[PDB]
């Protein structure tokens, strides 16, 4: 059994090597343990920051937007997550603009 902090550190190793799948495995494990109420010094916002980017790199845009929204619920002022949200909202508005014109 590994602490949430261990899982998070491992996910950062994966991320720094652009191993975005393993980043997702480790970060999701960390998030699960915190959600069950493990006492830990890592904060969910930073976990979600890495996780949202990793999921974006995998091409899973819906999931990346969801995670970005989860991050912003916890930290509404997060500058990059706000940036990423605006980007995802733009892409979605274009797709909906397309469906309305076709």
């Amino acid at each position: 059994f590994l602490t949430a902090e261990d899982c998070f550190e491992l996910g950062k190793v994966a991320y720094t090597e652009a191993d975005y799948y393993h980043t997702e495995l480790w970060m999701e494990q960390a998030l699960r343990q915190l959600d069950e109420g493990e006492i830990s010094t890592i904060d969910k916002v930073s976990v979600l920051d890495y996780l949202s980017y990793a999921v974006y790199q995998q091409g899973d845009l819906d999931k990346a937007l969801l995670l970005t929204k989860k991050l912003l619920e916890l930290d509404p002022e997060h500058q990059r997550a706000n940036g990423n949200l605006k980007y995802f909202e733009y892409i979605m508005a274009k797709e909906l603009e397309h469906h309305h014109h076709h």
Binding site: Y15, D49, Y50, Y53, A54, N84, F88
Partner: peptide, 6 residues
């Protein structure tokens, strides 16, 4: 573009 932790 989206920006992740640097």
């Amino acid at each position: 573009g989206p920006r992740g932790p640097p």
